[PDB]
Amino acid sequence: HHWGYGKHNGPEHWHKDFPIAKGERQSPVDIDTHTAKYDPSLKPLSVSYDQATSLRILNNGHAFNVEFDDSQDKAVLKGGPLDGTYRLIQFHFHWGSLDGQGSEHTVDKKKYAAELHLVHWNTKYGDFGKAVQQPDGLAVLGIFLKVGSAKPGLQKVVDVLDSIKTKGKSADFTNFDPRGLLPESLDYWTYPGSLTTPPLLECVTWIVLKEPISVSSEQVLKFRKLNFNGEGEPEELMVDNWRPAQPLKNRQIKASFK
Numbered sequence: 001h002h003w004g005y006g007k008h009n010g011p012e013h014w015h016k017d018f019p020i021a022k023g024e025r026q027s028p029v030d031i032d033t034h035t036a037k038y039d040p041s042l043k044p045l046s047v048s049y050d051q052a053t054s055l056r057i058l059n060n061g062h063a064f065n066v067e068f069d070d071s072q073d074k075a076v077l078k079g080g081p082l083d084g085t086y087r088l089i090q091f092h093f094h095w096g097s098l099d100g101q102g103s104e105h106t107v108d109k110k111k112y113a114a115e116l117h118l119v120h121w122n123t124k125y126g127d128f129g130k131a132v133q134q135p136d137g138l139a140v141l142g143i144f145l146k147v148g149s150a151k152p153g154l155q156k157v158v159d160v161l162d163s164i165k166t167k168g169k170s171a172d173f174t175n176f177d178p179r180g181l182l183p184e185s186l187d188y189w190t191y192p193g194s195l196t197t198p199p200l201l202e203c204v205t206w207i208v209l210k211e212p213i214s215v216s217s218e219q220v221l222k223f224r225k226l227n228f229n230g231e232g233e234p235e236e237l238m239v240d241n242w243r244p245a246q247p248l249k250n251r252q253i254k255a256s257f258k
């Protein structure tokens with residue numbers, strides 16, 4: 001009886017195994033755009049993904065992760081609200097059963113069809129597992145997806161999904177360029193929060209881009225053909241793998257713009 005996204009093991013249950021679920025800096029949150037504070041001292045985000053080396057794509061039973069070689073200073077995020085350098089380790093998505101839901105963060109209560117998370121760890125802690133134990137261990141770049149025109153740089157991901165349909169499947173997945181997943185603008189909101197999945201550790205500086213990317217109906221439909229179950233087990237479509245907005249508590253969301 002492990003955590004997941006259903007009635008009996010979904011987000012409202014996670015606190016029993018992971019009591020930090022009711023902690024002081026949980027994610028995601030609703031971004032109230034009128035109360036976010038513009039901070040003119042915030043710097044442009046620096047996304048340096050030219051030398052990224054993707055390795056593999058994995059269905060972990062909760063989402064799919066595209067993993068990168070994080071053993072050198074390739075694929076780094078810096079600037080913005082961050083001190084120092086954070087290295088890309090993986091990205092994944094959260095999405096809905098329907099186009100009207102799927103994102104984890106919300107914007108003035110609006111839900112997007114999906115949300116991309118590019119996960120980075122602070123190089124001062126040497127590796128991801130030590131970084132998650134620190135309050136400034138991770139930086140996650142969150143990007144909303146709306147359904148409209150296709151995102152051509154997403155198609156390589158969608159096309160490999162058939163090979164990782166069920167929990168535990170993985171495939172070689174080299175030469176994927178995550179630049180093709182970014183919107184034009186790097187304007188962002190930022191706040192201190194947590195992993196949105198167990199173990200829910202309170203180690204993340206969230207950087208949420210204001211501009212969504214568009215993906216096609218066909219592209220998101222292929223995400224919804226994945227399975228939470230393993231091969232040879234009864235089919236449970238991988239949909240609605242998002243945690244709802246959590247209390248803001250004693251936090252301020254800052255804007256890099258307007």
Ligand SMILES: CCCCNC(=O)c1ccc(Cl)c(S(N)(=O)=O)c1
Pocket residue numbers: 060062063065092117119138140194195196197198199204
């Ligand atoms: C036990 C791994 C379960 C799947 N969750 C993940 O792989 C995962 C890892 C790190 C982060 Cl920062 C996040 S998120 N959603 O970006 O907060 C998710």
Ligand code: NA
Pocket residue numbers: 148216217218
């Ligand atoms: Na369409």
Ligand SMILES: [Zn+2]
Pocket residue numbers: 092093094117196
């Ligand atoms: Zn995530």
